[PDB]
């Protein structure tokens, strides 16, 4: 990935590492709470400006910021309709069992592909560099997964065709 994806991964990793810093802030607007600030979007005091790391029109990522949480949204490089369908289904099956992850959301941001979430409650009970490493690894392995799914469906079609044609 030295000449194709390495710089993009390095830049996004540095951005995440800088924006992975978090702290606990007692609720300032609603009685007594410590709920995530990014989702609520109550006070502009805590929010930080969004950032994007991208190299092509159809692929993108977004990096948010706040005291309580940092939100990241990705957009995959999908070209053909089969790629879009497979990505949507795979992400949906990932959603259906997102409880064990403790990091992932429950529905992607509108107009974008899957997005993750971090919080001060997920930074001490879990390691720090491991989470960013996993996000990176997912970003790389998505293309492998989609290509493998494509070849699998092609093989299935071939085998069914061969099985039917033999009778003739």
């Amino acid at each position: 990935m030295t000449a194709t994806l390495r710089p993009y991964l390095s830049a996004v990793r540095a951005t995440l590492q800088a924006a992975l810093c978090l702290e606990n802030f007692s609720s300032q607007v609603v009685e007594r709470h410590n709920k995530p600030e990014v989702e609520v979007r109550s006070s502009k005091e805590l929010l930080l400006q969004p950032v994007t790391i991208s190299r092509n029109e159809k692929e993108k990522v977004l990096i948010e910021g706040s005291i309580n949480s940092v939100r990241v949204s990705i957009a995959v490089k999908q070209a053909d309709e089969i790629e879009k369908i497979l990505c949507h289904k795979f992400m949906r099956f990932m959603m259906m069992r997102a409880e064990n992850f403790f990091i992932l959301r429950r529905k992607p941001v509108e107009g974008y592909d899957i997005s993750f979430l971090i919080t001060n409650f997920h930074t001490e009970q879990m390691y720090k560099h491991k989470l960013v490493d996993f996000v990176i690894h997912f970003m790389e392995e998505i293309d492998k997964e989609i290509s493998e799914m494509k070849l699998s469906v092609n093989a299935r079609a071939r085998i069914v065709a061969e099985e039917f044609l033999k009778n003739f």
Binding site: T15, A18, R55, N56
Partner: protein, 134 residues
Amino acid sequence: RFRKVDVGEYDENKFVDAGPDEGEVDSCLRQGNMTAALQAALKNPPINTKSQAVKDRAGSIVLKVLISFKANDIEKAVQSLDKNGVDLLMKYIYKGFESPSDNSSAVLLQWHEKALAAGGVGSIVRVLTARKTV
């Protein structure tokens, strides 16, 4: 039909809270002194100005100046700068980075890599926590 309406019309302050030129940059470009072109591009930032015109002008000029560079003197260009200059640079690259199309990716990525090699994560922190619309 009650809570439907917002009640968020408060009073507590929800944190209620010099552009660049073109002729000099063009002269530097045609003369070939790319370092002078970049220096002029970074000069006179729109730190205090509320108008999309100057913002887009600065973004376009910095993008055009950066694109023309080659991947041999980028280190020299970055080195001949001050730390505040490096931060302002990185801010400009991030600003123009959203600009898609016209293959404005690779050069920006190399610039970001060099800035990290020199500016460090502190530049990322500063750009992320700067309510200042730059």
